[PDB]
Amino acid sequence: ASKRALVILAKGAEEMETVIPVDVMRRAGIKVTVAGLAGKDPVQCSRDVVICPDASLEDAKKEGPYDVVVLPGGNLGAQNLSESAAVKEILKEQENRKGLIAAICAGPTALLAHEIGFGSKVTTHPLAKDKMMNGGHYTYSENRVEKDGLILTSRGPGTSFEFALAIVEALNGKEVAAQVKAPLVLK
Numbered sequence: 499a500s501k502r503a504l505v506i507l508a509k510g511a512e513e514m515e516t517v518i519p520v521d522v523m524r525r526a527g528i529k530v531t532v533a534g535l536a537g538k539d540p541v542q543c544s545r546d547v548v549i550c551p552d553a554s555l556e557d558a559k560k561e562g563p564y565d566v567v568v569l570p571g572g573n574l575g576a577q578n579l580s581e582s583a584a585v586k587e588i589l590k591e592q593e594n595r596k597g598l599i600a601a602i603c604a605g606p607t608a609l610l611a612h613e614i615g616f617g618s619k620v621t622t623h624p625l626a627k628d629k630m631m632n633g634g635h636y637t638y639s640e641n642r643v644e645k646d647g648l649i650l651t652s653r654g655p656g657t658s659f660e661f662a663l664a665i666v667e668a669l670n671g672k673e674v675a676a677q678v679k680a681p682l683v684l685k
Contacts, residue, residue: 501670502529505568522662538554562588569605620639621640
């Protein structure tokens with residue numbers, strides 16, 4: 499069967515860190531659900547790009563389980579993810595069933611908020627490092643993409659392609675990732 503990705507889209511999400519993974523994962527033949535944290539209404543992203551979710555998180559979370567849960571960054575997006583009881587429940591379930599969790603830029607600070615993947619090697623945006631490392635619950639990495647078991651993290655808008663291709667490699671293997679990569683004209 500095709501792998502399934504849940505992308506949780508909150509107000510203030512970084513639209514590049516949302517659209518690049520959704521697009522690249524769909525190129526890989528992954529079934530992606532863009533789920534609105536606050537419901538099914540269009541979401542105003544950090545730079546005012548307005549994205550219409552596929553479903554509410556409320557509905558999407560009843561259609562589990564997912565092979566990957568994806569947390570985009572954007573400071574205000576990540577804060578909304580950090581404060582959500584529904585996000586807490588989804589990540590704990592994913593961690594318990596040993597499913598992949600992927601977070602980019604400020605996104606991984608939602609893992610800290612929900613006590614997900616403590617003891618993992620992680621990266622964040624340089625500006626999110628202090629917040630992520632509060633209490634020393636993770637070991638910090640400067641790699642553009644970091645994968646420690648089922649915690650996959652990445653640094654910024656400019657690592658979004660590598661982040662997305664790492665998710666594709668984890669779910670569909672190196673060959674599919676290489677096939678999806680070539681037509682993107684990456685460096």
